[model samples]
Target: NLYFQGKVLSEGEWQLVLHVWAKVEADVAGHGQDILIRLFKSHPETLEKFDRFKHLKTEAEMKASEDLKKHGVTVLTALGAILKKKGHHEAELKPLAQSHATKHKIPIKYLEFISEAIIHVLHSRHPGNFGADAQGAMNKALELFRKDIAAKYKELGYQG
Candidate 1:
């Protein structure tokens, strides 16, 4: 069983998520870039957080940015690592939560936005493969991740 945010998933359900994730693992940069692009489209304000790509005001400019591509790869790589651990990700998430709460001061909503963006990218990229089962599994996994991060943020004196 895989545990996530007080929810439990049987091996089969967790495997569905892993299976679908594997489809995009080969092109992490491409899919990660798409996820970020989707996020920026919905929340342009998020661009200000990234000093490297804050000047990329246009979608075309963002798509052409090597820095954005590199950041995308980084984001996906971290997510992949978390997934590899089967949702037992407290150790990995705590430091990130601390940094975001202290140094970055990023709003928690951005994490939710990123989760939505990830699901959107996965569904769009693998329209046929990412079925409801896989979506549900991934959603639960990320929800746990977000909850843990938020809990860490709260513990670190972040109000919201």
Candidate 2:
């Protein structure tokens, strides 16, 4: 997964992924809120996609919303599941992209944004080692995840 071009994740990459994932899972509530807040603040247009956030006038309120808390945790938890794996979980993940792209009407670009947001959150959370040893592996892992989701989106007729 981290090697990107191959299916096997190196032990070192796996350790790095697991370390950051542990930080994410340690406080799903807080970390989720942090990630979502960062996402919405930096990408306001994304807030429009959420009914709970669409009309919100303030970012603080949105971060405090229980709906965001639950959804945010769910999002990170899914990422945790992905990071814990050795290979692309496309069969498990394709349905996710399919459902979101088809039923939720979310544009495929948002999937990419979400991937970026996840990476951003991880970097902010672990700035010390993130740019040192962890950066490449993490980027490679998420790139694979995003590409798999994007492939699902294309398969489901999404042009982007």
Candidate 3:
């Protein structure tokens, strides 16, 4: 209820949030750091809650950085493998998604979902990037990242 929000996203929304979160820690490192730190320090007197979120936020940021790098590598590698045998980028990508991921026998769907999580993180860090992707994705991610915050405001449940 405190750290991760413990909420489920629509499949599409999840994909987009993962993507933006990936972008935040990768494309905007300094900004990501600032946001994480701000979140960590937002409530310093809670002791346990503060300590936990602080730790989690920092670790999450570090992990996200690595994840984004790996995703970029995987995308490029997939592009390479596909281009090796095909030319139509559009027509070639589906097979590449299969071959790039299927040979490892990993769940490609999970990988895609993870990509979308970053989209939310990036939005939290960089406010103006909203609606840059699928409207559904952007809307849901913002709803997740911010609604709880609004819910906490002045104990009115943010109904206004």
Candidate 4:
């Protein structure tokens, strides 16, 4: 999945989480998750932090990734909204990010990471531009969403 028209974009710390999680978790959603996660991973700045996250790949570690991935998407959406403001239509990854979150039962914080990472991906690809607060109301809704997903993962014994 890493092979493409460009060199591996490189990854930050969070992307390493997404990568390891994707590899360990089911790839049932097809290659989109793998592709986007890799795209996030390719940015050069976050490499060292990712190196640290690599050490904790246990169930606890996976759980953390799950935690981050869930909330990360929300962040990604915020990121998308922000990027849209900056004229980055392609970077507006809210729909997929939301679906990805729904599929994985990711947390709200994880959504934040997702949103921010997607935004960062835009920054890396574009070099100078990117883009949110969905709302104060969203904060509570997001928390509920995380709880639901985390519960599902726990029920399945799937290390999130």
TM-scores of the candidates are 0.90, 0.84, 0.32, 0.25
Worst 10 residues of 4 by lDDT: 128-137
Ranking by lDDT: 1, 2, 3, 4
Residue 85, candidate 2: C-alpha displacement in angstroms:
1.7
Query: Candidate 1: which stretches are off by over 4 Å?
Result: 1-7
lDDT of 2 by residue, 1-160 (tens): 3344336567777677778778778888888888888778777888887886577657778766889899888888887887777455866787788767886777767766776777787788777657657867777777777777777877888765
Error of model 4, residue 29, in angstroms: 18
lDDT of 4 by residue, 60-133 (tens): 44344653355345444443243222222223434434444455444345544443443344334432211122
Candidate 4 TM-score to native: 0.25
Instruction: Tell me how far the alpha carbon of residue 8 in candidate 2 is from the true structure, in angstroms, after superposition.
Output: 5.8
Show where candidate 3 strays beyond 4 Å: 1-89, 131-160
* Residue pairs with backbone atoms closer than 3 Å in model 1 (clashes): none
User: Taking the candidates one at a time, how many backbone clashes does each contain?
Assistant: 0, 0, 18, 34
Model 3 Cα lDDT, one tens digit per residue, 1-160: 2222214455555555445444543655454344433333443332132222333445456445554334445543442333222222334544434443334332333333333443444555555544666446655544442333233332432232
Q: Of the candidates numbered 1 and 2, which has the greater TM-score value? A: 1
